[PDB]
Every structure is written in C-alpha cells, then in structure tokens.
Design a protein around this ligand. Structure first.
Ligand SMILES: [Mg+2]
Ligand SMILES: [Mg+2]
Length: 56
RNA sequence: UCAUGGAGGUAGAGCACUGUUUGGACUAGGGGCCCUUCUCGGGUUACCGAAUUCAGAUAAACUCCGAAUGCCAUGUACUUA
C-alpha cells in the first residue's frame, strides 16, 4: 500500500489533473489517502507528482 | 489511470516527386570576330545559353519517412462520482 497526500492546490491546475486527484479520492489540501500499489494508481501519481507526496 | 488495438501525417527530418536554389561537368541554341559565301558549311568565341547530369541547400499550400501528445474504443484491471 501507499499513502498519498495532496500538498499543492488545484487552482491554476488543468482539469485532467483535477480529475486524476478526485479519482484518487482527494479533496482539500493536506488530505491523506491510502491506496494499493497498482500501476494504474502509479500512473495517476506520475501525472500529478508535482502536487503530491507519496509514502509507503 | 494501466494494459491492449487502432485511425491520423503535425513537430522534426529528408529529397524519393513537385517548386525555389549554389557550385562544377556538358550542351541544343542566340550575339559577335569572322573564313568565307547562293553566309551554304566551318575556326570558332568561356559573351551568354535551354535542357541533361554529379555533389550540396530549401519549403505553410513538397514528402520516401515520421514521433510526443491528443482522439476513438475494448477490458474483468484499479480507483472515483
Ligand atoms: Mg519543418
Ligand atoms: Mg510542412
């Protein structure tokens, strides 16, 4: 598993990034999510790594 | 989002066509000095010169090529509304 925290804002960020975030299950900043380590999920990571911190 | 399959001819690159073009080889032909002379045909001139050909450049309306992305979808994948 891995822990996904939303540290940057979505304001000024394109809707693809926003939708990736909402699909990860994130809302407000400094919000935490715990997910599996599927490559599907790692793709959402690698599309929004600039907004996110990942822990395992 | 991941995987998979696809249309598509952009960026770039390239010259395989089309145009634009540089240098060289080489020339139909035009101009002159003429030899002549029914100026017929030659000596021919680097004074030009269609084209042809070798190498090298160029292209929104050129393409032998050709991505990233984006798009169409499929899935049981994994989240989410
Ligand atoms: Mg170009
Ligand atoms: Mg073009």
């Amino acid at each position: 598993k891995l822990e996904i925290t939303l540290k940057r804002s979505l304001i000024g960020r394109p809707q693809p990034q926003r939708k990736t975030v909402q699909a990860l299950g994130l809302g407000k900043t400094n919000s935490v999510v715990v997910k599996e380590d599927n490559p599907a999920i790692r793709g959402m990571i690698t599309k929004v790594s600039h907004l996110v911190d990942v822990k395992e």
